[PDB]
Design a protein around this ligand. Structure first.
Ligand SMILES: CCCc1sc(-c2ccc(OC)c(OCC(C)(C)O)c2)nc1CSc1nc(N)cc(N)n1
Ligand SMILES: CCCc1sc(-c2ccc(OC)c(OCC(C)(C)O)c2)nc1CSc1nc(N)cc(N)n1
Ligand SMILES: O=c1ccn([C@@H]2O[C@H](COP(=O)(O)OP(=O)(O)O)[C@@H](O)[C@H]2O)c(=O)[nH]1
Ligand SMILES: O=c1ccn([C@@H]2O[C@H](COP(=O)(O)OP(=O)(O)O)[C@@H](O)[C@H]2O)c(=O)[nH]1
Lengths: 231, 230
Protein backbone atom coordinates (compact mmCIF):
# COMPACT_ATOMS: atom_id res chain seq x y z
CA UNK A 1 0.00 0.00 0.00
CA UNK A 2 2.79 2.48 0.78
CA UNK A 3 5.27 2.47 -2.10
CA UNK A 4 8.79 3.14 -0.90
CA UNK A 5 11.39 4.87 -3.07
CA UNK A 6 15.01 5.49 -2.23
CA UNK A 7 16.76 8.72 -3.40
CA UNK A 8 20.46 7.95 -3.85
CA UNK A 9 23.62 9.80 -4.87
CA UNK A 10 26.82 11.50 -3.75
CA UNK A 11 27.48 13.92 -0.94
CA UNK A 12 25.93 17.17 -2.22
CA UNK A 13 24.34 15.65 -5.33
CA UNK A 14 21.15 17.50 -4.22
CA UNK A 15 19.05 14.68 -2.69
CA UNK A 16 17.57 16.82 0.13
CA UNK A 17 16.99 19.56 -2.45
CA UNK A 18 15.02 17.18 -4.72
CA UNK A 19 12.95 15.73 -1.82
CA UNK A 20 12.11 19.18 -0.39
CA UNK A 21 10.80 19.89 -3.85
CA UNK A 22 8.91 16.61 -4.33
CA UNK A 23 7.07 16.52 -0.98
CA UNK A 24 5.23 19.81 -1.72
CA UNK A 25 3.93 18.61 -5.06
CA UNK A 26 1.49 16.17 -3.54
CA UNK A 27 -0.19 15.75 -0.21
CA UNK A 28 0.21 12.02 -1.01
CA UNK A 29 4.03 12.17 -1.06
CA UNK A 30 6.12 12.21 2.09
CA UNK A 31 9.89 11.98 2.73
CA UNK A 32 12.25 10.48 5.39
CA UNK A 33 15.41 12.61 5.82
CA UNK A 34 18.72 10.79 6.42
CA UNK A 35 19.70 11.17 10.08
CA UNK A 36 23.37 11.73 9.23
CA UNK A 37 22.35 15.07 7.64
CA UNK A 38 20.22 16.12 10.59
CA UNK A 39 23.38 15.47 12.69
CA UNK A 40 25.21 17.98 10.39
CA UNK A 41 23.06 20.92 11.57
CA UNK A 42 18.81 18.48 19.85
CA UNK A 43 17.71 15.14 21.40
CA UNK A 44 20.09 12.36 22.52
CA UNK A 45 20.36 10.82 19.03
CA UNK A 46 20.96 14.41 17.79
CA UNK A 47 23.41 14.61 20.71
CA UNK A 48 25.02 11.18 20.01
CA UNK A 49 25.19 11.79 16.23
CA UNK A 50 26.92 15.22 16.42
CA UNK A 51 29.53 13.69 18.66
CA UNK A 52 30.05 10.53 16.63
CA UNK A 53 30.01 12.53 13.36
CA UNK A 54 32.59 14.89 14.80
CA UNK A 55 34.61 11.84 16.04
CA UNK A 56 34.32 10.13 12.61
CA UNK A 57 35.77 13.35 11.02
CA UNK A 58 38.69 13.49 13.52
CA UNK A 59 39.71 9.84 13.33
CA UNK A 60 37.74 7.74 10.81
CA UNK A 61 39.79 4.57 11.35
CA UNK A 62 38.69 4.51 15.07
CA UNK A 63 35.02 5.57 14.60
CA UNK A 64 33.76 4.14 11.27
CA UNK A 65 32.26 0.94 12.75
CA UNK A 66 30.47 2.87 15.55
CA UNK A 67 29.26 5.68 13.25
CA UNK A 68 28.05 3.13 10.63
CA UNK A 69 26.08 0.99 13.06
CA UNK A 70 24.53 4.14 14.60
CA UNK A 71 23.70 5.80 11.28
CA UNK A 72 21.95 2.63 10.09
CA UNK A 73 20.12 2.09 13.35
CA UNK A 74 18.90 5.73 13.24
CA UNK A 75 17.84 5.38 9.60
CA UNK A 76 15.90 2.13 10.25
CA UNK A 77 14.18 3.66 13.27
CA UNK A 78 13.18 6.77 11.30
CA UNK A 79 11.99 4.92 8.18
CA UNK A 80 9.61 3.07 10.61
CA UNK A 81 8.63 6.36 12.39
CA UNK A 82 7.50 7.89 9.08
CA UNK A 83 6.14 4.62 7.69
CA UNK A 84 3.75 3.48 10.45
CA UNK A 85 3.10 7.16 11.31
CA UNK A 86 2.38 9.18 8.15
CA UNK A 87 0.29 9.37 4.96
CA UNK A 88 -2.56 7.66 6.76
CA UNK A 89 -5.56 7.99 4.39
CA UNK A 90 -3.64 9.26 1.32
CA UNK A 91 -5.03 7.71 -1.87
CA UNK A 92 -1.74 6.96 -3.63
CA UNK A 93 0.87 7.21 -0.86
CA UNK A 94 4.57 7.31 -1.76
CA UNK A 95 7.29 7.78 0.83
CA UNK A 96 10.68 8.96 -0.45
CA UNK A 97 13.72 7.78 1.54
CA UNK A 98 16.78 10.04 1.53
CA UNK A 99 19.19 7.11 1.08
CA UNK A 100 18.69 3.65 2.43
CA UNK A 101 20.09 0.84 4.52
CA UNK A 102 21.56 -0.38 1.20
CA UNK A 103 23.65 2.72 0.69
CA UNK A 104 24.67 2.42 4.36
CA UNK A 105 26.20 -1.02 3.62
CA UNK A 106 27.04 -1.46 -0.12
CA UNK A 107 28.29 2.13 -0.55
CA UNK A 108 29.50 3.88 2.60
CA UNK A 109 30.29 1.01 5.01
CA UNK A 110 31.90 -1.08 2.21
CA UNK A 111 34.00 1.95 1.12
CA UNK A 112 35.17 2.44 4.70
CA UNK A 113 36.25 -1.19 4.61
CA UNK A 114 38.07 -0.70 1.26
CA UNK A 115 40.00 2.33 2.46
CA UNK A 116 40.95 0.41 5.60
CA UNK A 117 38.99 2.48 8.19
CA UNK A 118 37.44 -0.81 9.35
CA UNK A 119 39.24 -4.17 9.65
CA UNK A 120 37.72 -7.45 8.36
CA UNK A 121 36.25 -8.31 11.79
CA UNK A 122 34.56 -4.90 12.01
CA UNK A 123 33.25 -5.17 8.47
CA UNK A 124 32.12 -8.75 9.00
CA UNK A 125 30.49 -7.94 12.36
CA UNK A 126 28.73 -5.03 10.67
CA UNK A 127 27.55 -7.26 7.82
CA UNK A 128 26.09 -9.73 10.36
CA UNK A 129 24.50 -6.89 12.45
CA UNK A 130 22.98 -5.43 9.15
CA UNK A 131 21.57 -8.71 7.74
CA UNK A 132 19.97 -9.36 11.11
CA UNK A 133 18.94 -5.84 12.11
CA UNK A 134 17.04 -5.49 8.85
CA UNK A 135 15.56 -8.98 8.95
CA UNK A 136 14.21 -8.57 12.50
CA UNK A 137 12.75 -5.06 12.45
CA UNK A 138 13.43 -3.90 8.89
CA UNK A 139 11.13 -6.06 6.76
CA UNK A 140 8.43 -3.50 5.95
CA UNK A 141 11.27 -1.57 4.29
CA UNK A 142 11.62 -3.52 1.02
CA UNK A 143 12.21 -0.98 -1.77
CA UNK A 144 9.76 -0.58 -4.67
CA UNK A 145 12.13 1.58 -6.73
CA UNK A 146 15.28 3.65 -6.54
CA UNK A 147 15.91 7.04 -8.07
CA UNK A 148 19.63 7.58 -8.70
CA UNK A 149 20.51 11.27 -8.88
CA UNK A 150 23.72 11.10 -10.90
CA UNK A 151 26.12 14.14 -10.61
CA UNK A 152 29.88 14.78 -11.08
CA UNK A 153 32.35 14.76 -8.16
CA UNK A 154 33.12 18.34 -9.33
CA UNK A 155 29.52 19.58 -8.98
CA UNK A 156 29.34 17.77 -5.65
CA UNK A 157 32.51 19.49 -4.36
CA UNK A 158 31.20 22.82 -5.66
CA UNK A 159 27.88 22.13 -3.98
CA UNK A 160 29.62 21.27 -0.68
CA UNK A 161 31.08 24.81 -0.74
CA UNK A 162 27.69 26.37 -1.53
CA UNK A 163 26.31 24.75 1.63
CA UNK A 164 29.24 26.06 3.66
CA UNK A 165 29.36 23.27 6.25
CA UNK A 166 32.67 24.19 7.92
CA UNK A 167 33.04 20.60 9.07
CA UNK A 168 32.69 19.54 5.39
CA UNK A 169 35.23 21.79 3.53
CA UNK A 170 38.11 19.33 3.94
CA UNK A 171 36.33 16.45 2.17
CA UNK A 172 38.52 15.95 -0.92
CA UNK A 173 37.79 15.26 -4.57
CA UNK A 174 39.19 11.73 -4.62
CA UNK A 175 36.77 10.70 -1.77
CA UNK A 176 33.83 12.08 -3.83
CA UNK A 177 35.35 10.23 -6.80
CA UNK A 178 35.38 6.76 -5.10
CA UNK A 179 31.78 7.12 -3.85
CA UNK A 180 30.84 8.27 -7.35
CA UNK A 181 32.29 4.92 -8.58
CA UNK A 182 30.53 2.94 -5.80
CA UNK A 183 27.27 4.54 -6.97
CA UNK A 184 27.90 4.24 -10.74
CA UNK A 185 28.81 0.55 -10.21
CA UNK A 186 25.72 -0.32 -8.10
CA UNK A 187 22.99 1.73 -9.80
CA UNK A 188 24.14 2.33 -13.40
CA UNK A 189 26.68 -0.33 -14.44
CA UNK A 190 25.24 -2.86 -11.87
CA UNK A 191 28.52 -4.72 -11.12
CA UNK A 192 27.97 -4.45 -7.35
CA UNK A 193 26.86 -7.69 -5.68
CA UNK A 194 24.45 -7.70 -2.66
CA UNK A 195 22.94 -10.24 -0.23
CA UNK A 196 19.43 -9.01 -0.99
CA UNK A 197 18.01 -10.99 -3.95
CA UNK A 198 15.22 -8.50 -4.78
CA UNK A 199 17.71 -5.61 -5.28
CA UNK A 200 18.47 -7.28 -8.63
CA UNK A 201 14.90 -6.89 -9.90
CA UNK A 202 13.93 -3.55 -8.28
CA UNK A 203 13.30 -0.67 -10.77
CA UNK A 204 15.95 2.07 -10.92
CA UNK A 205 15.59 5.56 -12.42
CA UNK A 206 18.66 7.66 -13.24
CA UNK A 207 18.54 11.50 -13.28
CA UNK A 208 21.20 14.06 -14.26
CA UNK A 209 21.39 16.86 -11.59
CA UNK A 210 24.59 18.26 -13.06
CA UNK A 211 22.62 21.35 -14.10
CA UNK A 212 20.86 23.40 -11.36
CA UNK A 213 17.18 22.56 -10.84
CA UNK A 214 16.08 24.78 -7.92
CA UNK A 215 13.98 26.95 -10.24
CA UNK A 216 13.82 24.49 -13.17
CA UNK A 217 12.68 21.05 -12.06
CA UNK A 218 9.61 20.09 -14.06
CA UNK A 219 11.31 17.62 -16.39
CA UNK A 220 12.86 15.88 -13.33
CA UNK A 221 9.40 15.60 -11.75
CA UNK A 222 7.91 14.18 -15.02
CA UNK A 223 10.54 11.42 -15.01
CA UNK A 224 9.45 10.55 -11.39
CA UNK A 225 5.64 10.34 -11.98
CA UNK A 226 6.26 8.39 -15.13
CA UNK A 227 8.62 6.01 -13.28
CA UNK A 228 6.10 5.62 -10.41
CA UNK A 229 3.38 4.43 -12.82
CA UNK A 230 5.51 1.45 -13.78
CA UNK A 231 5.13 0.31 -10.14
CA UNK B 1 4.02 -20.54 27.48
CA UNK B 2 7.73 -21.49 27.56
CA UNK B 3 9.16 -20.15 30.88
CA UNK B 4 12.30 -17.99 30.58
CA UNK B 5 14.70 -18.00 33.49
CA UNK B 6 18.08 -16.30 33.41
CA UNK B 7 21.04 -17.80 35.32
CA UNK B 8 23.10 -14.82 36.57
CA UNK B 9 26.60 -14.70 38.14
CA UNK B 10 30.29 -13.79 38.00
CA UNK B 11 33.01 -15.22 35.73
CA UNK B 12 33.64 -18.94 36.39
CA UNK B 13 31.18 -18.79 39.34
CA UNK B 14 29.66 -22.09 38.04
CA UNK B 15 26.95 -21.00 35.58
CA UNK B 16 27.82 -23.37 32.74
CA UNK B 17 28.33 -26.37 35.10
CA UNK B 18 24.99 -25.71 36.83
CA UNK B 19 23.06 -25.07 33.61
CA UNK B 20 24.37 -28.37 32.16
CA UNK B 21 23.19 -30.13 35.31
CA UNK B 22 19.63 -28.70 35.05
CA UNK B 23 19.40 -29.66 31.33
CA UNK B 24 20.06 -33.35 32.31
CA UNK B 25 17.17 -33.59 34.81
CA UNK B 26 14.00 -32.78 32.89
CA UNK B 27 12.94 -33.40 29.34
CA UNK B 28 11.07 -30.13 29.76
CA UNK B 29 14.37 -28.38 30.59
CA UNK B 30 16.60 -26.78 27.98
CA UNK B 31 19.55 -24.37 28.00
CA UNK B 32 20.76 -21.31 26.00
CA UNK B 33 24.49 -21.10 26.61
CA UNK B 34 26.02 -17.64 26.48
CA UNK B 35 27.58 -16.62 23.16
CA UNK B 36 30.86 -15.26 24.62
CA UNK B 37 31.37 -18.45 26.65
CA UNK B 38 31.52 -20.35 23.32
CA UNK B 39 33.99 -17.86 21.79
CA UNK B 40 35.98 -18.37 25.04
CA UNK B 41 33.78 -22.83 12.47
CA UNK B 42 30.63 -20.65 12.16
CA UNK B 43 30.76 -17.06 10.89
CA UNK B 44 29.74 -15.88 14.38
CA UNK B 45 32.56 -17.90 15.98
CA UNK B 46 35.37 -16.40 13.89
CA UNK B 47 34.24 -12.81 14.62
CA UNK B 48 33.50 -13.77 18.20
CA UNK B 49 36.95 -15.41 18.58
CA UNK B 50 38.68 -12.31 17.11
CA UNK B 51 36.83 -9.60 19.00
CA UNK B 52 37.28 -11.38 22.39
CA UNK B 53 41.06 -11.41 21.87
CA UNK B 54 41.09 -7.81 20.67
CA UNK B 55 39.14 -6.99 23.83
CA UNK B 56 41.73 -8.83 26.04
CA UNK B 57 44.57 -6.82 24.40
CA UNK B 58 42.96 -3.33 24.27
CA UNK B 59 39.60 -2.90 26.00
CA UNK B 60 39.12 0.85 25.50
CA UNK B 61 39.39 0.34 21.71
CA UNK B 62 37.06 -2.71 21.45
CA UNK B 63 34.60 -2.55 24.38
CA UNK B 64 31.80 -0.96 22.30
CA UNK B 65 32.24 -3.38 19.39
CA UNK B 66 32.40 -6.25 21.89
CA UNK B 67 29.28 -5.36 23.86
CA UNK B 68 27.25 -4.75 20.70
CA UNK B 69 28.16 -8.13 19.16
CA UNK B 70 27.92 -10.09 22.45
CA UNK B 71 24.35 -8.81 22.98
CA UNK B 72 23.32 -9.35 19.34
CA UNK B 73 24.69 -12.90 19.31
CA UNK B 74 22.75 -13.46 22.55
CA UNK B 75 19.42 -12.00 21.32
CA UNK B 76 19.58 -14.22 18.27
CA UNK B 77 20.66 -17.35 20.22
CA UNK B 78 17.70 -16.80 22.59
CA UNK B 79 15.19 -15.92 19.80
CA UNK B 80 16.09 -19.16 18.03
CA UNK B 81 15.55 -21.39 21.09
CA UNK B 82 11.97 -20.19 21.64
CA UNK B 83 11.64 -21.18 17.94
CA UNK B 84 12.75 -24.82 17.95
CA UNK B 85 13.07 -26.41 21.43
CA UNK B 86 10.11 -27.02 23.85
CA UNK B 87 7.18 -27.15 21.43
CA UNK B 88 6.41 -30.63 22.87
CA UNK B 89 6.44 -29.92 26.65
CA UNK B 90 3.72 -29.52 29.34
CA UNK B 91 6.10 -27.82 31.76
CA UNK B 92 8.62 -26.13 29.40
CA UNK B 93 11.50 -24.18 30.93
CA UNK B 94 14.18 -22.23 29.05
CA UNK B 95 17.26 -21.45 31.19
CA UNK B 96 19.40 -18.64 29.72
CA UNK B 97 23.11 -18.40 30.63
CA UNK B 98 23.01 -14.64 31.53
CA UNK B 99 20.60 -12.08 30.03
CA UNK B 100 20.40 -8.89 27.94
CA UNK B 101 20.13 -6.97 31.27
CA UNK B 102 23.23 -8.75 32.38
CA UNK B 103 25.04 -7.60 29.17
CA UNK B 104 24.20 -3.93 29.80
CA UNK B 105 24.02 -3.44 33.62
CA UNK B 106 26.86 -5.68 34.69
CA UNK B 107 29.30 -5.65 31.84
CA UNK B 108 28.65 -2.57 29.63
CA UNK B 109 27.94 -0.36 32.66
CA UNK B 110 31.19 -1.57 34.27
CA UNK B 111 33.38 -0.93 31.18
CA UNK B 112 32.03 2.63 30.90
CA UNK B 113 32.48 3.32 34.64
CA UNK B 114 35.98 1.96 34.24
CA UNK B 115 36.52 4.35 31.27
CA UNK B 116 36.86 1.72 28.57
CA UNK B 117 33.87 3.21 26.77
CA UNK B 118 33.48 6.93 26.54
CA UNK B 119 30.16 8.78 27.07
CA UNK B 120 29.06 8.72 23.40
CA UNK B 121 29.73 4.92 23.09
CA UNK B 122 27.79 4.34 26.30
CA UNK B 123 24.73 6.46 25.27
CA UNK B 124 24.76 4.91 21.73
CA UNK B 125 24.95 1.40 23.19
CA UNK B 126 22.09 2.17 25.56
CA UNK B 127 19.99 3.83 22.84
CA UNK B 128 20.33 0.69 20.68
CA UNK B 129 19.81 -1.68 23.62
CA UNK B 130 16.69 0.33 24.59
CA UNK B 131 15.28 0.50 21.09
CA UNK B 132 15.66 -3.13 20.11
CA UNK B 133 14.96 -4.89 23.45
CA UNK B 134 11.76 -2.83 23.36
CA UNK B 135 10.73 -3.90 19.83
CA UNK B 136 10.15 -7.47 21.06
CA UNK B 137 7.23 -6.54 23.36
CA UNK B 138 7.12 -9.54 25.77
CA UNK B 139 9.12 -12.25 23.90
CA UNK B 140 12.49 -12.77 25.57
CA UNK B 141 11.15 -11.17 28.82
CA UNK B 142 12.11 -13.24 31.87
CA UNK B 143 9.73 -15.17 34.17
CA UNK B 144 12.46 -15.06 36.82
CA UNK B 145 16.12 -14.83 37.76
CA UNK B 146 18.49 -17.33 39.40
CA UNK B 147 21.72 -15.87 40.89
CA UNK B 148 24.74 -18.07 41.48
CA UNK B 149 26.55 -16.19 44.14
CA UNK B 150 30.23 -16.84 44.74
CA UNK B 151 33.10 -14.71 46.03
CA UNK B 152 35.90 -13.35 43.85
CA UNK B 153 38.60 -15.74 45.27
CA UNK B 154 36.19 -18.59 44.56
CA UNK B 155 35.89 -17.28 41.00
CA UNK B 156 39.72 -16.91 40.76
CA UNK B 157 40.35 -20.57 41.82
CA UNK B 158 37.85 -21.75 39.26
CA UNK B 159 39.36 -19.57 36.49
CA UNK B 160 42.68 -21.39 37.20
CA UNK B 161 40.85 -24.73 37.38
CA UNK B 162 38.98 -24.02 34.12
CA UNK B 163 42.29 -23.31 32.30
CA UNK B 164 41.74 -21.22 29.12
CA UNK B 165 45.02 -19.32 28.28
CA UNK B 166 43.70 -15.76 28.05
CA UNK B 167 41.55 -15.75 31.24
CA UNK B 168 44.70 -16.68 33.24
CA UNK B 169 45.42 -12.94 33.25
CA UNK B 170 42.15 -11.89 34.97
CA UNK B 171 43.19 -10.03 38.11
CA UNK B 172 41.28 -10.60 41.33
CA UNK B 173 40.53 -6.87 41.04
CA UNK B 174 38.25 -7.17 37.99
CA UNK B 175 36.20 -9.95 39.61
CA UNK B 176 35.66 -7.58 42.55
CA UNK B 177 34.11 -4.83 40.43
CA UNK B 178 32.04 -7.58 38.73
CA UNK B 179 30.82 -8.85 42.16
CA UNK B 180 29.66 -5.50 43.69
CA UNK B 181 27.38 -4.94 40.68
CA UNK B 182 25.68 -8.34 40.80
CA UNK B 183 24.73 -7.41 44.43
CA UNK B 184 23.21 -3.98 43.70
CA UNK B 185 21.25 -5.44 40.82
CA UNK B 186 19.93 -8.70 42.27
CA UNK B 187 20.20 -8.79 46.09
CA UNK B 188 19.38 -5.30 47.39
CA UNK B 189 17.43 -4.87 44.15
CA UNK B 190 18.77 -1.29 44.03
CA UNK B 191 19.38 -0.77 40.29
CA UNK B 192 16.99 1.37 38.28
CA UNK B 193 16.66 -0.19 34.81
CA UNK B 194 14.70 1.01 31.78
CA UNK B 195 12.60 -2.19 31.74
CA UNK B 196 9.34 -1.94 33.76
CA UNK B 197 8.23 -5.58 34.26
CA UNK B 198 11.77 -6.42 35.55
CA UNK B 199 10.99 -4.69 38.84
CA UNK B 200 8.28 -7.42 39.13
CA UNK B 201 10.70 -10.27 38.23
CA UNK B 202 11.15 -12.62 41.23
CA UNK B 203 14.66 -13.67 42.14
CA UNK B 204 16.23 -16.84 43.54
CA UNK B 205 19.65 -16.39 45.12
CA UNK B 206 21.76 -19.48 45.61
CA UNK B 207 24.97 -19.50 47.62
CA UNK B 208 27.34 -21.50 45.35
CA UNK B 209 30.87 -21.38 46.95
CA UNK B 210 30.78 -25.12 47.99
CA UNK B 211 31.87 -27.36 45.04
CA UNK B 212 28.42 -28.60 43.91
CA UNK B 213 29.00 -31.12 41.10
CA UNK B 214 28.30 -34.00 43.47
CA UNK B 215 25.85 -32.29 45.82
CA UNK B 216 23.47 -30.14 43.75
CA UNK B 217 20.30 -31.77 45.03
CA UNK B 218 19.56 -29.02 47.60
CA UNK B 219 20.15 -26.26 45.02
CA UNK B 220 17.88 -28.04 42.50
CA UNK B 221 15.13 -28.52 45.10
CA UNK B 222 15.08 -24.72 45.44
CA UNK B 223 14.96 -24.17 41.64
CA UNK B 224 11.92 -26.52 41.59
CA UNK B 225 10.25 -24.74 44.55
CA UNK B 226 10.88 -21.39 42.72
CA UNK B 227 9.63 -22.62 39.27
CA UNK B 228 6.40 -23.84 40.93
CA UNK B 229 5.61 -20.49 42.59
CA UNK B 230 6.56 -18.76 39.37
C1 LIG C 1 28.98 13.17 4.70
C2 LIG C 1 29.20 13.12 6.23
C3 LIG C 1 29.46 11.69 6.73
C4 LIG C 1 30.92 11.30 6.46
S1 LIG C 1 32.24 11.97 7.19
C5 LIG C 1 33.30 10.97 6.32
C6 LIG C 1 34.63 11.00 6.40
C7 LIG C 1 35.21 12.02 7.15
C8 LIG C 1 36.59 12.14 7.29
C9 LIG C 1 37.38 11.20 6.63
O1 LIG C 1 38.74 11.23 6.70
C10 LIG C 1 39.18 12.53 7.15
C11 LIG C 1 36.82 10.19 5.86
O2 LIG C 1 37.72 9.36 5.28
C12 LIG C 1 37.21 8.08 4.91
C13 LIG C 1 38.32 7.34 4.17
C14 LIG C 1 39.42 8.32 3.76
C15 LIG C 1 37.74 6.68 2.91
O3 LIG C 1 38.87 6.34 5.06
C16 LIG C 1 35.43 10.07 5.74
N1 LIG C 1 32.63 10.16 5.51
C17 LIG C 1 31.31 10.35 5.59
C18 LIG C 1 30.35 9.50 4.75
S2 LIG C 1 30.11 7.83 5.49
C19 LIG C 1 28.36 7.76 5.62
N2 LIG C 1 27.78 6.58 5.92
C20 LIG C 1 26.45 6.44 6.01
N3 LIG C 1 25.96 5.20 6.27
C21 LIG C 1 25.64 7.57 5.80
C22 LIG C 1 26.28 8.79 5.49
N4 LIG C 1 25.62 9.94 5.27
N5 LIG C 1 27.62 8.86 5.41
C1 LIG D 1 34.95 -13.44 29.89
C2 LIG D 1 35.40 -12.83 28.55
C3 LIG D 1 34.81 -11.43 28.33
C4 LIG D 1 35.75 -10.32 28.88
S1 LIG D 1 37.25 -9.99 28.39
C5 LIG D 1 37.46 -8.69 29.46
C6 LIG D 1 38.57 -7.95 29.66
C7 LIG D 1 39.79 -8.43 29.17
C8 LIG D 1 40.99 -7.74 29.38
C9 LIG D 1 40.96 -6.55 30.11
O1 LIG D 1 42.06 -5.78 30.39
C10 LIG D 1 43.08 -5.65 29.39
C11 LIG D 1 39.76 -6.07 30.63
O2 LIG D 1 39.89 -4.90 31.32
C12 LIG D 1 38.65 -4.31 31.79
C13 LIG D 1 38.95 -3.02 32.64
C14 LIG D 1 40.03 -3.25 33.69
C15 LIG D 1 37.70 -2.61 33.42
O3 LIG D 1 39.39 -1.99 31.73
C16 LIG D 1 38.56 -6.76 30.41
N1 LIG D 1 36.34 -8.56 30.16
C17 LIG D 1 35.41 -9.46 29.84
C18 LIG D 1 34.03 -9.48 30.48
S2 LIG D 1 32.94 -8.29 29.60
C19 LIG D 1 31.44 -9.30 29.19
N2 LIG D 1 30.38 -8.74 28.56
C20 LIG D 1 29.26 -9.45 28.27
N3 LIG D 1 28.24 -8.84 27.67
C21 LIG D 1 29.21 -10.81 28.59
C22 LIG D 1 30.33 -11.36 29.24
N4 LIG D 1 30.36 -12.65 29.58
N5 LIG D 1 31.41 -10.61 29.52
O1 LIG E 1 20.10 22.56 -8.21
C1 LIG E 1 20.75 22.65 -7.15
C2 LIG E 1 21.07 21.51 -6.41
C3 LIG E 1 21.80 21.64 -5.24
N1 LIG E 1 22.18 22.86 -4.85
C4 LIG E 1 22.96 23.05 -3.65
O2 LIG E 1 23.96 22.05 -3.58
C5 LIG E 1 24.21 21.71 -2.23
C6 LIG E 1 24.05 20.19 -2.16
O3 LIG E 1 22.67 19.83 -2.21
P1 LIG E 1 22.01 19.03 -0.98
O4 LIG E 1 22.49 19.64 0.32
O5 LIG E 1 20.52 18.91 -1.17
O6 LIG E 1 22.74 17.66 -1.36
P2 LIG E 1 22.56 16.18 -0.79
O7 LIG E 1 23.88 15.86 -0.14
O8 LIG E 1 21.40 16.33 0.20
O9 LIG E 1 22.38 15.35 -2.01
C7 LIG E 1 23.24 22.53 -1.39
O10 LIG E 1 23.97 23.67 -0.92
C8 LIG E 1 22.15 22.95 -2.37
O11 LIG E 1 21.49 24.19 -2.08
C9 LIG E 1 21.86 24.02 -5.61
O12 LIG E 1 22.22 25.17 -5.25
N2 LIG E 1 21.15 23.87 -6.74
O1 LIG F 1 31.13 -26.37 41.81
C1 LIG F 1 31.95 -26.27 40.89
C2 LIG F 1 31.61 -25.58 39.73
C3 LIG F 1 32.54 -25.45 38.71
N1 LIG F 1 33.75 -26.01 38.84
C4 LIG F 1 34.74 -25.89 37.78
O2 LIG F 1 35.15 -24.52 37.70
C5 LIG F 1 35.28 -24.09 36.34
C6 LIG F 1 34.37 -22.88 36.08
O3 LIG F 1 32.99 -23.23 36.02
P1 LIG F 1 31.94 -22.73 34.89
O4 LIG F 1 32.59 -23.02 33.56
O5 LIG F 1 30.56 -23.28 35.14
O6 LIG F 1 31.75 -21.16 35.18
P2 LIG F 1 30.86 -19.99 34.45
O7 LIG F 1 31.91 -19.15 33.75
O8 LIG F 1 29.91 -20.61 33.45
O9 LIG F 1 30.24 -19.17 35.52
C7 LIG F 1 34.97 -25.30 35.47
O10 LIG F 1 36.21 -25.87 35.02
C8 LIG F 1 34.25 -26.29 36.39
O11 LIG F 1 34.58 -27.66 36.08
C9 LIG F 1 34.08 -26.71 40.04
O12 LIG F 1 35.21 -27.24 40.20
N2 LIG F 1 33.17 -26.82 41.03
Amino acid sequence: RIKKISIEGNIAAGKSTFVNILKQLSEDWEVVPEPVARWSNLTMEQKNGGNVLQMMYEKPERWSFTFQTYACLSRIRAQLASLNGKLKDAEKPVLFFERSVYSDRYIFASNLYESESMNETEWTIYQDWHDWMNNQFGQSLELDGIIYLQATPETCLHRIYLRGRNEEQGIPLEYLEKLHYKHESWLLHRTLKTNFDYLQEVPILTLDVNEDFKDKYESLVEKVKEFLSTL
